[PDB]
Amino acid sequence: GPSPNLPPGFDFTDPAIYAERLPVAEFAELRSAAPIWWNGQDPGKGGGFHDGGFWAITKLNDVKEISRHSDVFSSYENGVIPRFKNDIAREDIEVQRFVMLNMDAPHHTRLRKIISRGFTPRAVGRLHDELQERAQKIAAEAAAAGSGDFVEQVSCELPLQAIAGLLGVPQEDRGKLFHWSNEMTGNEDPEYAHIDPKASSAELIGYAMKMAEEKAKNPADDIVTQLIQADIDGEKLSDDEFGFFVVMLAVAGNETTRNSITQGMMAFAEHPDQWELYKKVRPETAADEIVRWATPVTAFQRTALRDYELSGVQIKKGQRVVMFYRSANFDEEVFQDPFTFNILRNPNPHVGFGGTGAHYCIGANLARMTINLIFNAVADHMPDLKPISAPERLRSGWLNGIKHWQVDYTG
Ligand code: HEM
Numbered sequence: 075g076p077s078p079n080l081p082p083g084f085d086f087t088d089p090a091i092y093a094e095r096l097p098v099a100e101f102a103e104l105r106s107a108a109p110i111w112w113n114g115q116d117p118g119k120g121g122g123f124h125d126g127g128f129w130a131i132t133k134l135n136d137v138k139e140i141s142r143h144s145d146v147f148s149s150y151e152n153g154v155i156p157r158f159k160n161d162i163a164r165e166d167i168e169v170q171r172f173v174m175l176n177m178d179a180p181h182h183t184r185l186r187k188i189i190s191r192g193f194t195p196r197a198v199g200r201l202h203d204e205l206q207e208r209a210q211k212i213a214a215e216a217a218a219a220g221s222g223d224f225v226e227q228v229s230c231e232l233p234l235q236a237i238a239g240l241l242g243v244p245q246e247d248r249g250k251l252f253h254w255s256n257e258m259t260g261n262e263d264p265e266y267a268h269i270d271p272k273a274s275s276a277e278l279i280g281y282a283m284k285m286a287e288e289k290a291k292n293p294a295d296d297i298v299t300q301l302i303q304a305d306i307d308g309e310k311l312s313d314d315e316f317g318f319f320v321v322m323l324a325v326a327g328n329e330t331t332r333n334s335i336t337q338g339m340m341a342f343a344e345h346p347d348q349w350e351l352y353k354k355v356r357p358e359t360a361a362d363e364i365v366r367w368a369t370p371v372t373a374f375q376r377t378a379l380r381d382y383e384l385s386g387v388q389i390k391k392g393q394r395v396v397m398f399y400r401s402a403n404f405d406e407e408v409f410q411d412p413f414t415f416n417i418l419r420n421p422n423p424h425v426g427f428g429g430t431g432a433h434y435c436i437g438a439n440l441a442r443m444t445i446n447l448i449f450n451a452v453a454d455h456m457p458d459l460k461p462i463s464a465p466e467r468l469r470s471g472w473l474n475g476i477k478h479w480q481v482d483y484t485g
């Protein structure tokens with residue numbers, strides 16, 4: 075049929091778009107008129123990839139099919155981040171293959187099995203009481219300030235305290251850990267143009283290898299002991315593997331959950347009836363609707379290892395496919411009234427945590443618990459908060475970020 079009604083040269087990974095808005099109408103146009111669509115990229119404008127473009131994947135069922143078929147659609151070949159600075163060196167993309175996220179089987183399979191010791195339901199549930207205490211304090215301290223930046227005073231700290239608590243990081247080191255974590259993303263935004271994620275990664279790995287050495291000497295009530303201890307078949311994280319895991323956690327669990335909190339509260343501000351129902355019932359289904367609505371990871375990519383026919387479209391070996399979770403989470407064929415914010419939506423088969431498959435977010439339930447604890451604390455301590463001014467968005471081609479949002483906690 076006809077081509078989609080998009081501006082000439084539109085690129086759905088363009089950071090200049092996301093600094094201003096989510097391209098919600100453009101995604102809906104692809105879903106209607108071209109659900110799998112070749113997004114061409116001009117020479118030098120591919121965000122670190124130099125292959126002419128990629129396939130835009132806009133439907134939830136296609137996102138799931140790609141995610142299940144990891145034997146064909148590789149994470150390792152080009153990594154899963156679909157946009158960097160246009161001048162990034164290929165070596166700086168390939169160095170990212172040392173984190174589990176950018177590995178294929180069998181290397182990913184081994185690493186995932188070991189790391190799963192650190193994300194058992196018991197390990198995550200063991201954080202519930204401390205994270206609930208920290209959430210209440212964060213909301214109380216924010217409310218006491220009267221007004222301020224909701225992103226910084228409500229959204230930022232609890233995700234970072236969740237990473238620190240999972241890892242057993244001493245309190246005197248958590249300032250350093252949070253700094254390194256915050257220096258890992260956003261470097262295409264002018265506000266963060268001076269951050270040095272390579273230097274931060276190196277500092278994190280060095281810190282993490284020292285922690286691995288020390289925690290072998292004395293096991294503690296952390297997951298670190300379970301990670302670096304050989305099983306019957308001698309499987310464990312080496313010290314440097316633990317380091318690359320910490321680098322991966324510092325990124326994976328920080329600005330993702332943060333942006334679900336900020337955009338969850340933005341949704342509540344825009345849907346007062348849902349906020350009144352939340353305060354009354356406190357339904358934990360709200361966390362999944364908040365993740366669906368916030369879709370903190372706009373997109374991850376894969377690379378075809380062989381020719382593959384997807385929904386009538388011939389994907390060719392070597393081509394990239396970009397899974398736009400932000401489109402799939404509003405797919406009219408899957409969700410009843412996708413553009414209604416409904417905190418009771420159940421079941422909620424969103425792909426905010428990815429499509430079901432080998433790389434499905436291992437921190438999904440830790441993320442949901444963090445969200446539920448902070449929004450209970452917000453409801454307890456600042457039930458009448460009202461926005462002061464519009465959110466400032468993050469210039470990124472794959473992360474859907476809010477840098478700042480002024481709020482009157484008093485109302
Ligand atoms: C709302 C918050 C979060 C969102 C939206 C999110 C989203 C995602 C997505 C989209 C993926 C890729 C899934 C795929 O490719 O199929 C992923 C993977 C991953 N996430 Fe999360 N995540 C969140 C929170 C967290 C937290 C809190 C942690 C840990 C503290 C975490 C750890 C990981 C790890 C380790 C992976 C890699 C898994 C693998 O490659 O096998 N995430 N996440």
Ligand SMILES: CCOC(=O)c1cc2cc(-c3ccncc3)ccc2n1CCN1CCOCC1
Pocket residue numbers: 155158166169170172173175258259261271272275321322325326327330371
């Ligand atoms: C060798 C250092 O490992 C990285 O670098 C790295 C890890 C990482 C993890 C995620 C991630 C996001 C969401 N869920 C799970 C994982 C995303 C990006 C990641 N990176 C790349 C950092 N980049 C920043 C700027 O440019 C250099 C690369």
